[PDB]
């Protein structure tokens, strides 16, 4: 069924991501995001692979997609703030790390990555 089809391309892309074949993970998750487009976990894994291949401009977009579908995923906000930090959008990343602290109070990244902003 449709849920199991959207699991298959996730489970497939995860195995390429574990093998460090990040681009093949992007390809698999794209087939799922294109089949379904309503699961926040599909683009959440796609953004991680884009971030490993240093395409932070593309990783930002898939992190925003996970936040449009779910809106509560602390990992997707931490991944968007991290992408923006290497993208030069440091003031926009400050707001995303402050948002991770709403989703998990005292979050270890949401203190530390928000603290990296001030290394001026």
């Amino acid at each position: 069924g449709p849920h199991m089809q959207a699991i298959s391309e996730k489970d497939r892309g995860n195995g390429f991501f574990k093998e460090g074949k990040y681009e093949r993970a992007i390809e698999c998750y794209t087939r799922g995001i294109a089949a379904d487009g309503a699961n926040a976990l599909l683009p959440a894994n796609r953004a991680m692979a884009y971030l490993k291949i240093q395409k932070y401009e593309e990783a930002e977009k898939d992190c925003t997609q996970a936040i449009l579908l779910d809106g509560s995923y602390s990992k997707a906000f931490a991944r968007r703030g991290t992408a923006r930090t290497f993208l030069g959008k440091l003031n926009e990343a400050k707001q995303d790390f402050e948002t991770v602290l709403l989703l998990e109070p005292g979050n270890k990244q949401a203190v530390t990555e928000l603290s990296k902003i001030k290394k001026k």
């Binding site: 892309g13 991290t82 998990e104």
Partner: peptide
Amino acid sequence: DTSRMEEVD
């Protein structure tokens, strides 16, 4: 505890 960034499913 809280969520780590660098991971997939």
